[PDB]
Write a protein that binds this ligand. Structure first.
Ligand SMILES: Nc1ncnc2c1ncn2[C@@H]1O[C@H](COP(=O)(O)OP(=O)(O)O)[C@@H](O)[C@H]1O
Ligand SMILES: Nc1ncnc2c1ncn2[C@@H]1O[C@H](COP(=O)(O)OP(=O)(O)O)[C@@H](O)[C@H]1O
Lengths: 306, 309
């Protein structure tokens, strides 16, 4: 289901060694671990890493959310926590300005004011560990980032790690995916575990409809082609974006007002859930005057070069 | 208009001696006078006495009302913003103070510190300058023991003799521009129920009647006939009181009647009736509060000209 020991955690090298060193040192000196901050793209397994750390330290977990916190933070900190446990907060950059200022005394000297004529009681808190997860250090204020003892980064997964995660999922579900098929599914994923799991579930549905018990590489490739994925993992939406840019604008510089309107999209999700992968794959460039196709989308889309 | 010196105050003997002694002693030792509480029936000149005391002390006033300083934040605002050292804070109807408002009055009166009304909000303990608080209420039973214990001086306002009401009427006529005679003013005061407000109201009504009749000097006969036109008897009874006695005697034979049949027989309520009607009747020996009801005391039969039982 979900890994518990740090050895069961899939991938994430150059971080498990450092995390293990810190955890064993904290256990040896018999003190709670310092507050930890986890960066990286969403859905790489930050909550799972928090659970693994909590299970390795032999303490409880109090997972909560950023936009779910006023005195409710104090209510969570007061009774729901023992000494040395974790208070993993997801999307810590979305904390309210009022609620953020209450965290600094909590993390600094472990005393904070509780609500209630009078509303100022400096209730002392037990020593605890706070883990925060946010997608980018630029979204967090300097005073909050300064109060975290350990800051780490989660990198993307190699296709083999995603393949073995797909293997674990299939073993748990009761499927007999093959090595080549799972590796192809992982390769067509965008280095994200959630995307790999979603793709595996869709391939499982397609194979079940087709009437098969063992999924081979050819069947997985056919199902993924039916989904609408290319060899670079591009969906239909990204291909549509590149096609409309190249056709309607000749590939020339286009600002992030004409491109979104031409696609019936918004300047929101587009350029934050579509363009990052295109730039990472060398498919789109952010010219100061607009955007270009980098001469590679012409080869990918089979169009004559400019 | 309004008297300022304690000598100009009309009547109220056996109280001006003690009040003068206290005022002069406080002036001699150069300290604010202790908190004062005066009882008495309403409209005998309590606010006027407060004004006289304040003027004789040579300080200001902050006259307010009982049911107007609830939510004690405004009480703190009044005590801090609009007061100096030694200023009276006369509160009318002090018994109608809210429990929350009253609880904040005790520290202000005892040690002159109060908690004025956000993480902290109502936490500041403002130091309060020495001041005098004067309270006004009708009956000592309406005030709670903790509040009554905080007052250094407690006195009582008694009713006015007819001569005092008469000279008050003369002063009112002089201020207005009328030439009432001494006998007419004495009759008006005699038909008043020992209170100054009623005497002034009667004088204004008699002035209107005389003006309508087309006169310039009001004589005793004119005042008597105008008061008869008003509906006042020799004992000062209004039409309502005579109606009460008449309905009791006729419809109930003068026998004991509770304060549920009597109010309903008069379309009144058990409220103002027995509060603004029966006090005078009992005081004049016209009605008695029997345990089983009420009786006419054998004098209402003579007053109303009915055969005795
Ligand atoms: N490295 C991993 N090994 C095993 N399971 C994982 C891993 N990473 C994520 N998961 C699975 O994904 C879930 C975490 O949700 P996810 O969206 O991937 O994290 P995030 O919300 O941080 O992106 C867990 O339930 C877990 O089963
Ligand atoms: N002893 C007095 N001498 C002169 N004027 C008085 C006296 N008593 C009351 N008054 C007049 O009555 C007014 C006070 O109102 P009143 O109803 O008599 O007091 P309370 O509301 O305490 O019964 C003042 O304006 C004042 O002119």
């Amino acid at each position: 289901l979900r890994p518990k020991t740090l050895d069961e955690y899939i991938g994430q090298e150059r971080l498990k060694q450092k995390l293990r060193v810190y955890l064993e040192a904290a256990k040896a000196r018999k003190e709670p671990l310092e507050h930890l901050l986890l960066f990286g793209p969403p859905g790489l397994g930050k909550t799972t890493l928090a659970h693994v750390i909590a299970h390795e330290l032999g303490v409880n977990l109090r997972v909560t959310s950023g936009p779910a916190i006023p005195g409710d933070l104090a209510a969570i900190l007061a009774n729901s926590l023992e000494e040395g446990d974790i208070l993993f907060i997801d999307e810590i950059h979305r904390l309210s300005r009022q609620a953020e200022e209450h965290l600094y005394p909590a993390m600094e000297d472990f005393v904070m004011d509780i609500v209630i004529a009078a509303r100022t009681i400096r209730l002392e808190l037990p020593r605890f560990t706070l883990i925060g997860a946010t997608t980018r250090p630029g979204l967090i204020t300097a005073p909050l980032l300064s109060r975290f003892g350990i800051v780490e980064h989660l990198e993307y997964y190699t296709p083999e790690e995603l393949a073995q995660g797909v293997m674990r999922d299939a073993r748990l579900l009761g499927v007999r995916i093959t090595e080549e098929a799972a590796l192809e599914i992982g390769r067509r994923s965008r280095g994200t575990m959630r995307v790999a799991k979603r793709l595996f579930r869709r391939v499982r549905d397609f194979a079940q409809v087709a009437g098969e018990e063992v999924i081979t590489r050819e069947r997985a490739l056919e199902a993924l082609a039916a989904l609408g994925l290319d060899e670079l993992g591009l969906e239909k939406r990204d291909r549509e974006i590149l096609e409309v840019l190249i056709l309607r604008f000749g590939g020339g510089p286009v600002g992030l007002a004409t491109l979104a309107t031409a696609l019936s999209e918004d300047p929101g999700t587009l350029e934050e859930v579509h363009e990052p992968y295109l730039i990472r794959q060398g498919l789109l460039k952010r010219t100061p005057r607009g955007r270009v196709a980098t001469e590679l989308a012409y080869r990918h889309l089979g169009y004559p070069p400019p």
